[PDB]
Protein backbone atom coordinates (compact mmCIF):
# COMPACT_ATOMS: atom_id res chain seq x y z
CA UNK A 1 0.00 0.00 0.00
CA UNK A 2 2.46 2.67 1.14
CA UNK A 3 5.06 3.68 -1.47
CA UNK A 4 8.81 2.97 -1.60
CA UNK A 5 12.10 4.81 -2.17
CA UNK A 6 15.64 3.74 -3.11
CA UNK A 7 18.46 3.97 -0.59
CA UNK A 8 22.17 3.25 -0.88
CA UNK A 9 23.12 1.20 2.18
CA UNK A 10 26.19 2.75 3.80
CA UNK A 11 27.95 -0.40 4.92
CA UNK A 12 27.49 -2.47 1.75
CA UNK A 13 26.77 0.02 -1.02
CA UNK A 14 23.66 -2.04 -1.80
CA UNK A 15 20.86 -0.09 -3.47
CA UNK A 16 17.72 -0.96 -1.51
CA UNK A 17 13.99 -0.42 -2.04
CA UNK A 18 12.73 0.76 1.37
CA UNK A 19 9.19 1.54 2.48
CA UNK A 20 8.26 5.18 2.60
CA UNK A 21 7.14 6.61 5.93
CA UNK A 22 3.61 8.08 6.30
CA UNK A 23 2.95 11.84 6.48
CA UNK A 24 3.48 13.15 9.98
CA UNK A 25 6.63 11.08 10.35
CA UNK A 26 10.11 10.74 8.90
CA UNK A 27 12.62 7.93 8.39
CA UNK A 28 14.64 7.64 11.58
CA UNK A 29 16.34 4.47 10.25
CA UNK A 30 16.60 3.35 6.64
CA UNK A 31 15.97 -0.29 5.82
CA UNK A 32 18.89 -2.71 5.27
CA UNK A 33 18.84 -6.09 3.56
CA UNK A 34 17.78 -7.69 6.86
CA UNK A 35 15.73 -4.96 8.54
CA UNK A 36 12.70 -2.77 7.97
CA UNK A 37 13.14 1.00 7.81
CA UNK A 38 11.88 2.69 10.99
CA UNK A 39 9.66 5.80 11.07
CA UNK A 40 9.38 8.37 13.85
CA UNK A 41 6.85 11.12 14.45
CA UNK A 42 7.80 14.64 13.42
CA UNK A 43 9.00 16.55 16.47
CA UNK A 44 6.97 19.53 17.69
CA UNK A 45 7.52 22.45 15.31
CA UNK A 46 7.95 20.31 12.20
CA UNK A 47 5.85 18.49 9.63
CA UNK A 48 5.75 16.35 6.49
CA UNK A 49 2.69 16.57 4.26
CA UNK A 50 3.16 13.26 2.43
CA UNK A 51 4.55 9.73 2.45
CA UNK A 52 8.28 10.31 2.37
CA UNK A 53 11.73 8.85 2.63
CA UNK A 54 13.33 11.88 4.27
CA UNK A 55 15.52 12.01 7.37
CA UNK A 56 14.11 15.17 8.94
CA UNK A 57 10.71 16.86 8.95
CA UNK A 58 10.28 20.42 7.67
CA UNK A 59 10.28 23.27 10.20
CA UNK A 60 6.97 25.08 10.37
CA UNK A 61 6.84 28.73 9.32
CA UNK A 62 7.11 31.49 11.92
CA UNK A 63 4.20 32.35 14.27
CA UNK A 64 1.45 34.44 12.71
CA UNK A 65 1.91 38.24 12.94
CA UNK A 66 -0.86 39.80 15.05
CA UNK A 67 -3.70 40.46 14.37
CA UNK A 68 -3.45 37.40 12.13
CA UNK A 69 -4.27 34.07 13.70
CA UNK A 70 -3.89 30.43 12.80
CA UNK A 71 -6.58 28.69 10.75
CA UNK A 72 -4.37 25.55 10.77
CA UNK A 73 -1.76 24.80 13.44
CA UNK A 74 1.84 23.71 13.10
CA UNK A 75 1.27 19.96 13.48
CA UNK A 76 2.93 16.74 12.34
CA UNK A 77 1.14 16.86 8.98
CA UNK A 78 0.68 20.57 8.43
CA UNK A 79 2.58 23.81 8.44
CA UNK A 80 0.62 26.46 10.34
CA UNK A 81 -1.60 28.68 8.17
CA UNK A 82 -2.38 32.29 9.08
CA UNK A 83 -5.41 34.43 8.41
CA UNK A 84 -7.06 37.67 9.41
CA UNK A 85 -9.51 36.79 12.22
CA UNK A 86 -13.27 36.63 11.56
CA UNK A 87 -14.74 40.11 11.08
CA UNK A 88 -11.57 41.24 9.29
CA UNK A 89 -10.03 40.94 5.81
CA UNK A 90 -6.48 40.95 4.44
CA UNK A 91 -5.73 44.53 3.47
CA UNK A 92 -2.44 46.15 2.42
CA UNK A 93 -0.12 43.63 4.09
CA UNK A 94 -2.39 43.58 7.14
CA UNK A 95 -5.94 43.07 8.50
CA UNK A 96 -8.82 45.61 8.45
CA UNK A 97 -12.32 45.38 9.96
CA UNK A 98 -15.03 44.59 7.40
CA UNK A 99 -17.17 47.45 6.14
CA UNK A 100 -20.24 48.06 8.31
CA UNK A 101 -23.26 48.56 6.01
CA UNK A 102 -25.38 51.36 7.57
CA UNK A 103 -29.11 51.46 8.18
CA UNK A 104 -30.85 51.60 4.82
CA UNK A 105 -28.13 49.33 3.34
CA UNK A 106 -27.38 45.64 3.53
CA UNK A 107 -24.77 43.01 2.79
CA UNK A 108 -24.74 42.11 -0.91
CA UNK A 109 -21.63 39.98 -0.74
CA UNK A 110 -20.44 38.42 2.49
CA UNK A 111 -17.06 39.52 3.74
CA UNK A 112 -14.20 36.99 3.88
CA UNK A 113 -10.63 36.87 5.18
CA UNK A 114 -9.39 38.29 1.86
CA UNK A 115 -12.29 40.38 0.57
CA UNK A 116 -14.27 43.10 2.32
CA UNK A 117 -18.03 43.04 2.72
CA UNK A 118 -19.95 44.47 -0.23
CA UNK A 119 -22.93 46.64 0.75
CA UNK A 120 -25.89 47.57 -1.41
CA UNK A 121 -28.72 50.04 -0.79
CA UNK A 122 -31.86 48.16 0.26
CA UNK A 123 -34.13 47.51 -2.73
CA UNK A 124 -37.70 48.76 -2.57
CA UNK A 125 -39.79 46.42 -0.46
CA UNK A 126 -36.82 45.63 1.83
CA UNK A 127 -35.14 47.39 4.75
CA UNK A 128 -32.20 47.25 7.14
CA UNK A 129 -32.69 48.98 10.50
CA UNK A 130 -29.28 48.29 12.01
CA UNK A 131 -25.65 49.05 11.15
CA UNK A 132 -24.01 45.71 10.33
CA UNK A 133 -21.29 43.95 8.43
CA UNK A 134 -23.26 40.71 8.13
CA UNK A 135 -27.01 41.29 7.81
CA UNK A 136 -28.88 41.54 4.52
CA UNK A 137 -31.85 43.82 3.92
CA UNK A 138 -35.12 42.21 5.05
CA UNK A 139 -38.44 42.04 3.20
CA UNK A 140 -41.30 44.10 4.60
CA UNK A 141 -43.86 42.29 6.74
CA UNK A 142 -46.51 41.39 4.14
CA UNK A 143 -49.58 43.23 5.40
CA UNK A 144 -52.01 41.90 2.79
CA UNK A 145 -50.91 38.32 3.49
CA UNK A 146 -52.14 38.99 7.02
CA UNK A 147 -55.44 40.48 5.93
CA UNK A 148 -54.20 43.85 7.13
CA UNK A 149 -53.45 47.10 5.37
CA UNK A 150 -50.24 49.10 5.47
CA UNK A 151 -51.09 51.80 7.98
CA UNK A 152 -47.58 53.24 7.68
CA UNK A 153 -45.22 52.75 4.73
CA UNK A 154 -41.78 51.36 5.37
CA UNK A 155 -38.52 52.91 4.24
CA UNK A 156 -35.13 51.39 3.43
CA UNK A 157 -34.47 51.66 7.16
CA UNK A 158 -37.81 50.49 8.59
CA UNK A 159 -40.48 47.81 8.04
CA UNK A 160 -43.92 48.94 6.96
CA UNK A 161 -46.46 49.07 9.79
CA UNK A 162 -49.48 46.81 9.18
CA UNK A 163 -52.98 47.41 10.49
Amino acid sequence: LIGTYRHVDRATGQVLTCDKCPAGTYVSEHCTNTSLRVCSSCPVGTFTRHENGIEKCHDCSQPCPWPMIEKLPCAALTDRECTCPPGMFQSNATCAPHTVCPVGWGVRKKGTETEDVRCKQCARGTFSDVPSSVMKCKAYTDCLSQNLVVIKPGTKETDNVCG
Side-chain angles (χ1 to χ4, degrees):
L1 177 281
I2 192 165
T4 59
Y5 67 96
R6 294 178 181 96
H7 176 70
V8 173
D9 178 58
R10 175 182 62 69
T12 63
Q14 179 178 17
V15 172
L16 302 155
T17 285
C18 301
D19 296 304
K20 278 182 176 177
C21 280
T25 70
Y26 69 101
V27 177
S28 49
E29 295 171 60
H30 290 283
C31 74
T32 62
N33 192 59
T34 57
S35 66
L36 297 180
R37 60 93 174 87
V38 176
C39 307
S40 287
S41 49
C42 287
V44 299
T46 71
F47 73 96
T48 49
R49 306 184 193 282
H50 310 84
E51 283 181 2
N52 65 82
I54 60 174
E55 289 112 327
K56 196 176 181 180
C57 298
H58 315 289
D59 296 312
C60 285
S61 317
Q62 301 300 298
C64 303
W66 176 93
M68 294 194 77
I69 55 167
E70 294 179 9
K71 57 173 172 177
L72 273 186
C74 164
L77 174 56
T78 62
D79 184 14
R80 85 182 88 238
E81 262 180 40
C82 306
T83 181
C84 285
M88 301 185 88
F89 75 99
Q90 181 221 300
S91 181
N92 298 179
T94 189
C95 300
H98 284 150
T99 286
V100 171
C101 306
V103 298
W105 292 63
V107 175
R108 179 186 71 68
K109 178 181 184 301
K110 177 174 184 167
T112 69
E113 50 183 279
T114 55
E115 292 191 61
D116 190 16
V117 161
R118 265 83 208 189
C119 304
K120 61 178 181 180
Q121 233 179 317
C122 294
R124 291 183 289 80
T126 73
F127 72 102
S128 184
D129 65 345
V130 293
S132 175
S133 62
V134 307
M135 290 164 77
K136 306 187 183 177
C137 298
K138 303 298 210 302
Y140 289 166
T141 292
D142 190 326
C143 298
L144 287 61
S145 64
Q146 306 177 311
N147 296 306
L148 295 179
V149 184
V150 179
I151 54 180
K152 198 185 173 200
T155 63
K156 293 178 187 305
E157 304 165 358
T158 58
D159 188 7
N160 58 196
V161 185
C162 299

